[PDB]
Amino acid sequence: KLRRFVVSPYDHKYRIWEAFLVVLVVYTAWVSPFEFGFLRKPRPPLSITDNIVNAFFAIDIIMTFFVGYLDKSTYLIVDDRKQIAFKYLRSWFLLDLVSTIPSEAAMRISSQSYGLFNMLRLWRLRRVGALFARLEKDRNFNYFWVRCAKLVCVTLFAVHCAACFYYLIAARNSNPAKTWIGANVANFLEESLWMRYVTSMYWSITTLTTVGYGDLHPVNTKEMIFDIFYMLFNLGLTAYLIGNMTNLVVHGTSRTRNFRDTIQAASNFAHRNHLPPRLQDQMLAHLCLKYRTDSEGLQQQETLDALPKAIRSSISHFLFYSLMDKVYLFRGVSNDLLFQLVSEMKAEYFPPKEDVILQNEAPTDFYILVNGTADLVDVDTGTESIVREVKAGDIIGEIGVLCYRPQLFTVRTKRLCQLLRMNRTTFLNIIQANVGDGTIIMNNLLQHL
Amino acid sequence: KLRRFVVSPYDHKYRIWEAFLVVLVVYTAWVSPFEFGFLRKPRPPLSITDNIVNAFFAIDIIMTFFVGYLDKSTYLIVDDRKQIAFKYLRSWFLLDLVSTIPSEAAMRISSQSYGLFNMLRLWRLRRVGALFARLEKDRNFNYFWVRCAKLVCVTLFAVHCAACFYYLIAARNSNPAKTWIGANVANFLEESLWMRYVTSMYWSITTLTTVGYGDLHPVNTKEMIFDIFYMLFNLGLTAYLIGNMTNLVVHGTSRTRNFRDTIQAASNFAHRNHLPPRLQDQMLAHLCLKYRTDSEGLQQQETLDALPKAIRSSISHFLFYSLMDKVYLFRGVSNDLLFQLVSEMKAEYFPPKEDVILQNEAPTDFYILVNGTADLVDVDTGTESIVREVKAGDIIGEIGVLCYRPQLFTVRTKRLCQLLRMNRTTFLNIIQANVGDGTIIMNNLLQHL
Amino acid sequence: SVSSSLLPAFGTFIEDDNPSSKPFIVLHFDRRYRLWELFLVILVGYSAWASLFELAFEKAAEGALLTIDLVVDFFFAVDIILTFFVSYLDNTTYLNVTDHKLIAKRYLKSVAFVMDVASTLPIQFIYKTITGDVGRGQAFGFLNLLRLWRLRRVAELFKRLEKDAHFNYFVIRVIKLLCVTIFWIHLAGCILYWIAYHYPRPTDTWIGSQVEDFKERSVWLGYTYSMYWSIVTLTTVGYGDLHAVNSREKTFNMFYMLFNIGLTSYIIGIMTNLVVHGALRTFAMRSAINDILRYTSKNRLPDTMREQMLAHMQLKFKTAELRQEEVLQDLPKAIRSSINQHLFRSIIEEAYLFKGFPEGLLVQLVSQIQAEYFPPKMEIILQNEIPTDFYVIVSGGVDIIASKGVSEQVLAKLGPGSMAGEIGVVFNIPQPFTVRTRRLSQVIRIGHHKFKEMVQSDNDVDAKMIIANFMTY
Amino acid sequence: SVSSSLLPAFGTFIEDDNPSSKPFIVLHFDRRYRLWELFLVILVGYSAWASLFELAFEKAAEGALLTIDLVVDFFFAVDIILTFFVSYLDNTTYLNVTDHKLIAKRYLKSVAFVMDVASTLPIQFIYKTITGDVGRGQAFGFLNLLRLWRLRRVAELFKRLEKDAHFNYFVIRVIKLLCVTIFWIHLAGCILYWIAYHYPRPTDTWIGSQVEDFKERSVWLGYTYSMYWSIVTLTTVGYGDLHAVNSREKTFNMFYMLFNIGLTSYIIGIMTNLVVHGALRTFAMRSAINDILRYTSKNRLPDTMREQMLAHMQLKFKTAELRQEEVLQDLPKAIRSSINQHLFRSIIEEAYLFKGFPEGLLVQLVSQIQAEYFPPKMEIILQNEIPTDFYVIVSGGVDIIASKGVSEQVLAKLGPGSMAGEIGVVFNIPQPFTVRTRRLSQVIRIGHHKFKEMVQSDNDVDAKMIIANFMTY
Ligand SMILES: [K+]
Ligand SMILES: [K+]
Ligand SMILES: [K+]
């Protein structure tokens, strides 16, 4: 793993520190543009908060000599100090060093640079792009609310960034009475710093959303030229938003458009072939139940069945071995016979009051219940003489399949059940290959008494 | 066919009259709303033109008792007078009768109705919907240029129809100084009837396209309420326009997106398998030639090959029988042997300087030229000793296939050629079944001398 | 017939059959109950309007809108004493639970009951007699916003309609956008008027700049002004005649037209998805037909060949269509077998080869038959082919072809219910014929090494007589 | 290498190989010539701007824009004396025609020559000395609109770039929209200024309402005002500060924003098609991974099973990908066979069964081999199956399975170049094994009744020794 006293790329405290470094980077996205357009020299409320953020980013850049990294040509986790150090000093060392310099110290170098110096603090905005790539290749995060939250952040950052540039064009003017803001409120240089920001954001949003009331428009030619490039940029930006919002609606209404496309087919099918008014309802019940059952991960065979037979045999073994072992028939049969008996066994669901086995039928299959219940009703001259009821983890149809005689009792569900089905041919094959069938028939005649 | 002196649904004069009654409906779609919003009593320039259009539509409604029709339950062309007459009088008789009444005659019934009476002349607008359904289920007309034009017509009619309603709200006001138009040009009731229309169309398009400068906006509450329903309608109307314009762009860039998707595959394929720098260029040449050759109807096998073998045998016979018969080999062979020889024969294209048959090769196939030319170059110690060149309608590779000896001359194209290919096995089968092979080999040895 | 009964959106008729109907219980899928639910939902459309309206305008709550809230708060008070007599359906059992002491404590334990009683309270009416006046002020009006809890009933209908196939998915999908976008116009125009009405200086507002005496005019003048502003902003026209003036209006206004971006991008993304899927089928049929005409035009083929190619491709797409109604493959084997034993029982019972056969083996055959369809002149079995399968024709026709090297002669014509391709299967020889269809046919396949093993290894009853039936044929 | 040479968009290095290069001829696909064409196209971008600019403003044509039109009209005058020395390519022969007397009369007979000489005329410059002044008036300026004929060269580049696969289809199709939408902003802002400049009353205009002395200020003030109006109208902001005043401006203005509907619907329809196809594969590899995790979560499966299912589905999509690079099926049999005789000649030459074989039959085998790929644990041949095909493995591995009823034992491991499934084919018995892959394999199939007929009926050379080679194995 690692040397004494050192740090790793996936370690928890490192991901937690890094998420707090992303909230600090979202606070310098708001503050860096605002100190460039709206302020000239460090004022108290931010002169200390930005130094706090600077100390935190200095702590981070000095902790990056003690952090692992991962090659994309070897994929080995390189954790040797004299090598991560050089890869840090490769590209992002002094770029991340200028991005944390106390601006009060850049003032003594020169005035006129405060707003422009703290504008390269937007270099520490690569972290948001990193986080947004990681969250959207990750699969624990909904791709809808991870991509749709990136188009909210770059739209709120263009609106905010253009609102501080367009105000700085007006604040740096001479005779601030023919400006965009100095034309509506003449005395705008003595106003609450929150009113200036509100009326700049207002213009930005009207223009970005193409409402364009008409109050707050360009007045000079310097502002017209800015506005020509902002509306060019906005036109391109909104086209791409509308594109991304269709890529997230047609891929969002698939699993419902595929269902009414099935109940429709199941009605044309029953219409062509003239099914009596007893099979169409059964078909529709089993197709519905399928949507609820496979809306969850309880049922999936469209793609889970495209796996190999050595993968789908580990899954169906892990899910049902504990169940298959607790059946009276296969008491002490073997170690592998149970494995291949549970390997080729197809699980199915059944709606309530849906008899899986009719009396006097031809004994094709036998089922093993997994969950739910049912009752062994028999049809006689006096019908509806319900005798017993099975539970989860029991086997039905066994006497007509191991002796080849018509089924004697009809089992009818009374709850959404899940059974395991095995044909007569398959079972007879896999047990005909072996010797342990003596134990099976002995358990059978033991059950009979 | 028909009784003496009567008319039919598809006859050429009937379609020519019925497309002349569409440029008279486009005339009324413009005039009807304009006489409702901008005029009060019949003025000279239109009082006679609309009576002309009325006479033409009266001629048409009186000619519809002598026109066939087609059942959608029998598909028989019903042309019995006492039956088309009743189907006319079924629905569209007095609806098409009120729609042609001289408005000067509706004035004597009552005033106040002129503009509202000539507004139901928009009943004779079903003909445009008829024409637009016919042209877009027809296949001689470009769907892109016909579905799109219908969208343009409805927008031009909403813009124009809303421009005459919104002006009539202002012209019917009292004190026309707080109106939408009576607020910008105070003396708008004495202005050129073309200036009023221009400034109403201007507001219409500005509002419909969502520019909304701000000059010419609602002033009263009667106009605000109209504008709330016009901008609602427009909200829906533009949304379907943008929808229809995507349905006509993704279906319009398919045949090009499928080509660079092929030259890309043909480069990954040559990259994986390390083809020398002599086969990749040949593969790309033959794939390019396919786009030019298939852009036209010269080459089509993606879907033409999904036909039965009794349809693809009539096509390939009709196209190539005249060619196959003029070959020296099959002089007087038979009537059917030629048919089934030309039935199973695959036509192919070859770029220039692309030798189809190399010397000393194993004699697999033989080709029959259809068009283009080529020359029989032979490779010797002294190479490039071109001996002759073939033309369209001649057979190459015949001596190595009918005697099973390596090919003796290499044929190399000199123009984009089209040949017919036949395997050795297929030909040997179909001629082995018959007796006429004696004539074939006799023509062969006759050619040899 | 319970899942069948609960799949119709507006419920279905419940008759004296009494399969689940017990006394003193209303079944939730009954048609009367679903019509009553639709009634309450069209009253919800009124309560969504009248509750936002009285928040913003506050001089409406004195007139004829306070005896309409009392009549509508009555039909919602009888739907609380009637939700104790209504069935429900588990999502872990699917049994229709209709026992009172179990209905009467899943309503109680739910948020629905406390919210339904906190919505149906006539607060403004009880305040009107236990005090002297109607409620008034900034914060008192935030009390009929509790009746926006009933929008959950409109969220229901537009969810049990997008699953009923009896209803067009374009009509209801489009309607949900209408209802959502004009509730929000109305919601936002009432909030901006609410902001202007309660502002200290009545002339530094969006409406007090235009109508100085806006607080004393009719409520339907302020309403029309607010709805006009709201719609020229939502649609993004923005004439700019009415616009935000102070910073409370600028702030809500620029939160309003930020959500408008999402709303109008969503409306567009939905209308460009109900137009792009309303054309996929037609594009495939037109994509296919377009080349045929291109091929028949580039070459000068007769028009008869073009009436043949087109008719055949139409018949091919008909098969490709009606063969995608094959839904019966994921259903459990019991229901699939009971359906097959209705479709193809008398076809396979009488086919000259399954004549003397045990019932068990007949069922074992019928339970597995997957039927396929074929266009009118496809060849399903080529001559001298490996005998992999054989077919049974349930309807349609096929011809028997014997190529002479150079010919194809129709030896015989087979119709419904007669086996095609059995000779090479029973003899294990290359299939000595060519069966190609003649009409649009449906055939059921019986593969080799599936029928042979089943007739050979398993059963001990059938023997020695099917060979006598084959040598009879 | 002519079609290969003419498929790169930017042109290619022509060296001393002289395959088509004759004296006194420039090949149209030469690098140098295509770089010169790109040069002329970036001069077209200047001439599109400067020609509309001098129509509208007309006080620009006196300054430094009349010796820039003379330098640019020189590089377009040497491209007319150099189109007589440039090859061309027939679309009926595809031969690179490079004979002067045939180039020199397809240019002449074309509209291109007369238009290129009617565009390169320095009309405004010849008018500047044969007369005293620069051209002036409403109709005189409609003479540098002839230089918008050179936009056909920009229409070329954005057509020979949408076919070169070396260039991103998103970049170029987006730059096309950029170039088209900002030429039209500029075109429309110059027409509205042209309308205002020549209007009788200079203060009932769109700009004379704002700047009363607009005709005497700089040209780059009118230009910025016009471009500002044009872009707040195209984008549909429409502040309304600058708007149409008279009916000439209202009419053009409402023809401008009617075409804007189409233009902005087209930009949207294109940007929502380069985003919807840029997410058509990833949204399918995510559709099949999403339910794997859903299934591994709903049930409490170990994470090792989830690292197995995922790895296998990745390996499956890799095959489904690299098996769609099978382009080699429509090409003529000659080129397909020459490619196969390079890929799979030494595999089929040495496979213990094709050892003593005629060269003709080896070629007859190699010409037909269509290779397929298989994910790592699929079974290509089930035991007791009908012997329909047999396989030859070119690379990868397979195992031989012999089920004991209840087992599966790996009998042997086969690698590259060894036949899998031949026993049941040569003996015509049910395939007495089960060949299932172990690594991602590529196999070439040799069906039955295609190999048997070919080795049996046709050739008379091979006999009696392949049975000796099979009994040796
Ligand atoms: K606007
Ligand atoms: K505006
Ligand atoms: K707009």
Swiss-Prot record, chains A, B:
Residues forming coiled coils: none
GO molecular function terms listed in the Swiss-Prot or TrEMBL record: identical protein binding; inward rectifier potassium channel activity
Membrane topology of the entry: Multi-pass membrane protein
Binding positions for a nucleoside 3',5'-cyclic phosphate per the UniProt entry: 329-449
Predominant location category: membrane
Keyword field: ANK repeat, Cell membrane, Ion channel, Ion transport, Membrane, Phosphoprotein, Potassium, Potassium channel, Potassium transport, Repeat, Transmembrane, Transmembrane helix, Transport, Voltage-gated channel
Intramembrane: 199-218
Family to which this protein belongs: Belongs to the potassium channel family. Plant (TC 1.A.1.4) subfamily.
Comment, domains: The segment S4 is probably the voltage-sensor and is characterized by a series of positively charged amino acids. The pore-forming region H5 is enclosed by the transmembrane segments S5 and S6 in the Shaker-type (1P/6TM) and contains the GYGD signature motif which seems to be involved in potassium selectivity. The KHA domain (rich in hydrophobic and acidic residues) present in the C-terminal part is likely to be important for tetramerization.
Record GO biological process: potassium ion import across plasma membrane; potassium ion transport; regulation of stomatal closure; response to salt stress; response to water deprivation; root hair elongation
Name of the protein: Potassium channel AKT1
Subunit structure: The potassium channel is probably composed of a homo- or heterotetrameric complex of pore-forming subunits. Possible heteromultimer with AKT2 or KAT3. Part of a K(+)-channel calcium-sensing kinase/phosphatase complex composed by a calcium sensor CBL (CBL1, CBL2, CBL3 or CBL9), a kinase CIPK (CIPK6, CIPK16 or CIPK23), a phosphatase PP2C (AIP1) and a K(+)-channel (AKT1). Interacts directly with AIP1, CBL10, CIPK6, CIPK16 and CIPK23.
Induction context: In roots, strongly reduced after 2,4-dichlorophenoxyacetic acid (2,4-D) treatment and weakly reduced after benzyladenine (BA) treatment. In shoots, strongly reduced after abscisic acid (ABA) treatment and induced after benzyladenine (BA) treatment.
Portion held of the full protein: 44 to 492 of 857
Tissues showing expression: Preferentially expressed in the peripheral cell layers of root mature including root cortex and root hairs. Detected also, at a lower level, in the mesophyll of the leaves and at restricted sites corresponding to hydathodes and guard cells.
Gene Ontology cellular component annotations, sorted alphabetically: monoatomic ion channel complex; plasma membrane
Swiss-Prot record, chains C, D:
Topological domain spans for side Extracellular: 59-65, 132-141, 198-224, 245-248
Intervals, Cytoplasmic compartment: 87-110, 163-176, 270-473
Membrane topology: Multi-pass membrane protein
Induction pattern: Strongly reduced in roots after 2,4-dichlorophenoxyacetic acid (2,4-D) treatment and after benzyladenine (BA) treatment. Strongly induced in shoots after NaCl treatment.
One of the record's GO molecular function terms: voltage-gated potassium channel activity
Residues that hold a nucleoside 3',5'-cyclic phosphate according to the record: 353-473
CC per GO annotation: endoplasmic reticulum; monoatomic ion channel complex; plasma membrane
Transmembrane stretches, start-end: 38-58, 66-86, 111-131, 142-162, 177-197, 249-269
UniProt superkingdom: Eukaryota
Gene Ontology biological process terms in this record: potassium ion transmembrane transport; response to nematode
Keywords, sorted A to Z: Coiled coil, Ion channel, Ion transport, Membrane, Potassium, Potassium channel, Potassium transport, Transmembrane, Transmembrane helix, Transport, Voltage-gated channel
Intramembrane segments: 225-244
Keyword Transport (UniProt): yes
Annotated compartments: Membrane
Reported tissue expression: Expressed predominantly in root hairs and root endodermis and, at a lower level, in leaf nodes, trichomes, and hydathodes.
Function field: Probable modulatory (alpha) subunit of inward-rectifying potassium channels. Could mediate potassium uptake from the soil solution by plant roots in association with AKT1.
Family the UniProt entry places it in: Belongs to the potassium channel family. Plant (TC 1.A.1.4) subfamily.
Quaternary structure (record): The potassium channel is probably composed of a homo- or heterotetrameric complex of pore-forming subunits. May interact with AKT1 and AKT2. Interacts with SLAC1.
Domain comment in the entry: The segment S4 is probably the voltage-sensor and is characterized by a series of positively charged amino acids. The pore-forming region H5 is enclosed by the transmembrane segments S5 and S6 in the Shaker-type (1P/6TM) and contains the GYGD signature motif which seems to be involved in potassium selectivity. The KHA domain (rich in hydrophobic and acidic residues) present in the C-terminal part is likely to be important for tetramerization.
UniProt-recorded name of the protein: Potassium channel KAT3
Organism in which the protein naturally occurs: Arabidopsis thaliana (Mouse-ear cress)
Name of the gene encoding the protein in the UniProt record: KAT3
